Amino acid sequence: CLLQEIRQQLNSDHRDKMETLEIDRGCLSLNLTSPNISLKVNPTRIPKDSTTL
Amino acid sequence: REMESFYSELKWQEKNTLEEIAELQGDIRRLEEDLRRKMMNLKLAHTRLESRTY
């Protein structure tokens, strides 16, 4: 039972890191002359999460 | 003699002023295009931040 619970938490953490890698690779792939760039509303804000390193 | 000397000098100054006006227009348009390029870099930074906030 304990091993089942630990594997559930590790599955959630793995999903979070895969989605993170994907968004960061998209943000790297953006460059100049790209059709998705625009001026964004409040880009310097800090969201409610605000985890530190 | 005095009148024609002054006339020649005034046309020489006309020539030099016209050349300066032309080259200053060229520098004005180069400055104006670099404004819009810096605006493009600003848009890129804003969308990188709001991309990472998801």
Swiss-Prot record, chain A:
Expressed in the testes (at protein level). It comes from the Eukaryota. It is found in: Cytoplasm, Cytoskeleton, Cilium axoneme; Cytoplasm, Cytoskeleton, Flagellum axoneme; Cytoplasm, Cytoskeleton, Microtubule organizing center. Ubiquitinated, leading to its degradation. Deubiquitinated by USP16, promoting its stability. Tyrosine phosphorylated. Microtubule inner protein component of sperm flagellar doublet microtubules. May interact with CCDC172. Belongs to the tektin family. Microtubule inner protein (MIP) part of the dynein-decorated doublet microtubules (DMTs) in cilia and flagellar axoneme. Plays a key role in the assembly or attachment of the inner dynein arm to microtubules in sperm flagella and tracheal cilia. Forms filamentous polymers in the walls of ciliary and flagellar microtubules. This is Tektin-2. The lineage of its organism: Eukaryota, Metazoa, Chordata, Craniata, Vertebrata. The chain holds residues 163 to 215 of 430 of the full protein.
